[PDB]
């Protein structure tokens, strides 16, 4: 039974993406309630904005011809008066659509550059040729659940049970923690000999349903996945996103996930820790206020996130809310074409 | 429980629209059967073709430069040898997509013109600078239901119960009647101190479900609304309408609504009073006849309305009928691109 809505309890910075980085949410929650001894502990979890990957915020310079990264550096200085990339913490290999197949393994020792998929154009990091991924942690507290000695999971500060089943050991700046298969990374060494975490990141198969978790539950899980896949396939074939189609990519269960929005015809994503919404009065107290993180969330040009927009009369239009009220707005059906994020 | 089909009992004139004037039908019927005293009465209701709005049938003239509405008047005379607009009866303010945000409040006293959204082009009424909305009524009869003294609703000539709950007082040419929230206007003064009707017309929230009308019923109501919204969003993103997608905008319950068709790659709408269809033999007696209003409805180029078309063999192809018979026609899936109705 999904809640009527899920709202980001914590929302990270917005980073532009293309329609091909969109993904269907993981609407699956694991209970793992076979243990009943609770002990408190403190831990560092990945800061919001770093759970998925760590950004580089680089730039692409066009010469044509092959430029030398000195004039482009000067040109970049004159231009402002970008193009992010993701590292793999297991091996420090840059990831980006411009990189051919991604995997720019050599950034510091092998070479000081790696060209894009297009031969002529090159990409250069804004920061020096090194990866800083150390100040990306926030301190939290939780209630461990460990049965006899092997930890099942823990209940974090938000009251959400996060299981360690299937968790993969991953080390970030000397802190060997565990990457939970819900996405989050937690600084726990309680795992004795769990498998080291493969470099396939979160794109790999999440399993968690081959254990036959109440096939009746998986029925609606697959139904929601099919609805999201219909929306996503429509988005990729039409190359345009509406707010009602963007509302289908929202995570239907509390936990870590992605939040999406359109800012000036640019597709954005952000790390989000969703929380269950029981009533619509929880998140819309006053006329034009969307309550996110204990405050009126600031809209830009009238759009908040996950298909929520400000109406012509100033009302917060949540596509899930409007459908339940049998109200229709052409603003939620207007499809905006998303320009390709990386032409080169 | 919706009928297998609904057919227009009375159909108004066809007026061209763009895909942005399409709307999902109101498939909600109110019973309001708390009163049992029936008394007959006579009334004037809005003639079909005027329930939604009253048309002006204007024209847009292109000079460029700012023309004077004398050469354009002569040019219009030479051209035939249009562009309608809607008034608000509460304030007589013209409505049209070309008007910036609509609301051409000044048409007679304030000014003799109001320019389009594009600065250079202007729009001029075909009729003199005044609004005639008096000969727009038809005489009917009904059975009132008034409990003790406050009217619940009435049963009109078509045997349909039309409730006065939520009705808003509205005056048309000196006849103070009531605008029922199903759309129709009825010349009744039985309402004592019901609220004067806001200028938000039928675009405003219809409510009628916040009263919690059997949430099981609202389940399928919302399901049908979601199907219609899927069809409408597909129509607006693809900018093209097929007959099978146009068949999703049909009102699923008897009452007043909109009928849609494509005439020469032009999207049309008309006022329609739908009636329940119990069998397919009701509306298709002979091979190539669609029975609308007690006669063979005249198709133009083989298309009738609401996705109904004439087949290659001469059979009337109703998309709802064909799906129930497990028959597939490429004619009902052909998407025709709708040119933008008001470029300027």
């Amino acid at each position, epitope marked *: 039974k999904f809640p009527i809505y899920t709202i980001p309890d914590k929302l990270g910075p917005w980073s532009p993406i293309d329609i091909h980085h969109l993904s269907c949410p993981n609407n699956l929650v694991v209970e793992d309630e076979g243990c009943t001894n609770l002990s408190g502990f403190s831990y560092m979890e990945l800061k919001v904005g770093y759970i998925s990957a760590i950004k580089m915020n680089g730039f692409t310079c066009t010469g044509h011809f092959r430029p030398t990264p000195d004039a482009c550096r000067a040109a970049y200085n004159w231009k402002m008066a970008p193009s992010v990339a993701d590292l793999d913490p297991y091996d420090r290999s840059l990831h980006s659509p411009v990189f051919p197949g991604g995997n720019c393994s050599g950034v510091a020792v092998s070479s000081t550059y790696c060209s894009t998929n297009h031969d002529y154009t090159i990409w250069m990091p804004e920061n020096p040729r090194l990866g800083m991924s150390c100040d990306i942690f926030t301190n939290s*507290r939780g209630k461990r659940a460990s049965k006899g000695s092997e930890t099942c999971g823990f209940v974090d500060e938000r009251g959400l049970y996060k299981s360690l089943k299937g968790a993969c050991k991953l080390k970030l700046c000397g802190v060997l923690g565990l990457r939970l298969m819900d996405g989050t990374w937690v600084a726990m060494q309680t795992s004795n000999e769990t498998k080291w975490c493969p470099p396939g990141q979160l794109v790999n198969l999440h399993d968690f349903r081959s254990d036959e978790i109440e096939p009746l539950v998986v029925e609606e899980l697959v139904k929601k996945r099919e609805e999201c896949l219909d929306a996503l396939e429509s988005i990729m074939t039409t190359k345009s996103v509406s707010f009602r189609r963007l509302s289908h990519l929202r995570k239907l269960v509390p936990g870590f996930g992605k939040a999406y929005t359109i800012f000036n015809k640019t597709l954005m994503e952000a790390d989000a820790h969703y929380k269950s919404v*029981r*009533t619509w009065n929880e998140i*819309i*107290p*006053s006329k034009g*206020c969307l309550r996110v993180g*204990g405050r009126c969330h600031p809209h830009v040009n009238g759009v908040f996130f996950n298909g929520i927009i400000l109406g012509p009369d100033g009302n917060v239009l949540i596509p899930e809310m409007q459908s339940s009220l049998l109200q229709q707005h052409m603003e939620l059906l207007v499809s905006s074409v998303i320009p390709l994020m990386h032409p080169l | 429980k919706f009928p297998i089909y609904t057919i227009p009992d009375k159909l108004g004139p066809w007026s061209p629209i763009d895909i942005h004037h399409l709307s999902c039908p109101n498939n909600l019927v109110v019973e309001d059967e708390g009163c049992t005293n029936l008394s007959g009465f006579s009334y004037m209701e809005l003639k079909v073709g005027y329930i939604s709005a009253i048309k002006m049938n204007g024209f847009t003239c292109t000079g460029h430069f700012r023309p004077t509405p004398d050469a354009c008047r002569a040019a219009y005379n030479w051209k035939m040898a249009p562009s309608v607009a809607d008034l608000d009866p509460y304030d007589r303010s013209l409505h049209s997509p070309v008007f910036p945000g609509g609301n051409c409040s000044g048409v007679a006293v304030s000014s003799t013109y109001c320019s389009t959204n594009h600065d250079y082009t202007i729009w001029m009424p075909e009729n003199p600078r005044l609004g005639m909305s008096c000969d727009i009524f038809t005489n009917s009869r009904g059975k009132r239901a008034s409990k003790g003294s406050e009217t619940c609703g009435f049963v009109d000539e078509r045997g349909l119960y039309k409730s006065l709950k939520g009705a808003c007082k509205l005056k048309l040419c000196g006849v103070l009647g009531l605008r029922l929230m199903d759309g129709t206007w009825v010349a009744m003064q039985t309402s004592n101190e019901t609220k004067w009707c806001p200028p938000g017309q039928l675009v405003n929230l219809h409510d009628f479900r*916040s009263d919690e009308i059997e949430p099981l019923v609202v389940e399928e109501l919302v399901k049908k609304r979601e199907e219609c919204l899927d069809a409408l969003e597909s129509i607006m993103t693809t900018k093209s309408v097929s007959f099978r997608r146009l068949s999703h905008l049909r009102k699923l319950v008897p009452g007043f609504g909109k009928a849609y068709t494509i005439f020469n790659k032009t999207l049309m709408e008309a006022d329609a009073h739908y009636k329940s269809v119990r069998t397919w033999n009701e509306i298709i007696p002979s091979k190539g006849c669609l029975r609308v209003g007690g006669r063979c409805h005249p198709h133009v180029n083989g298309v009738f309305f609401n996705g109904i078309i004439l087949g290659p063999d001469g059979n009337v192809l109703i998309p709802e009928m064909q799906s129930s018979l497990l028959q597939q026609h490429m004619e009902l899936l052909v998407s025709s691109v709708i040119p933008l109705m008001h470029p300027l």
Partner: antibody
Amino acid sequence: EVQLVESGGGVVQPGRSLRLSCAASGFTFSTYAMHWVRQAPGKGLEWVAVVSYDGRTKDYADSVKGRFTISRDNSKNTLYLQMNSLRTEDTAVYFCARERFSGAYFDYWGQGTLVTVSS
Amino acid sequence: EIVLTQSPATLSLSPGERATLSCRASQSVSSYLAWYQQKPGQAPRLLIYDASNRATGIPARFSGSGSGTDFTLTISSLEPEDFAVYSCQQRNNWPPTFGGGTKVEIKR
């Protein structure tokens, strides 16, 4: 200054119906979610019902759900609580509270009208 | 519905003394707690919201502290008008819930 005045509270027999009315002034009543909060004698405050700024969304306490019905009239700037099937423990001082524009809190309350449910 | 526990129920002190009121939640309510002061026959008054912020027109002697499960309201100097019933309210979850209330009384 924001003023909330609630009236309509009186002695009612169990199982009967009472309707409370709260009049609002000093603020835009149509842009705020208004709650009803009751305080039983010798007991703490207890949230009863909420109506949204437009009246489309309404929620009630578990002990209240199915019996009371909150409503509002933005034109009248008045908030209504329709108590039905009143029971013995429904007696309390009922406050009409205004929710913060962003917050989860009741920044302004009313004086509170006492409702007594006893034969 | 989660239970806000307020201890002690009765807190007797003297004017010019610090008063420490504690609210404990059944589960963590993050920073979304509010403090209301109510006097007999008078509308309840919002003192502290978000567990730290002070409402408009509230004297500076009222302060809020805590997060998660344990919270605290402190009056720096109990004035004669501060001897009322103080109630803690949270909304981290629906429905809004109040504490049992703590009464501040003058000791003699």
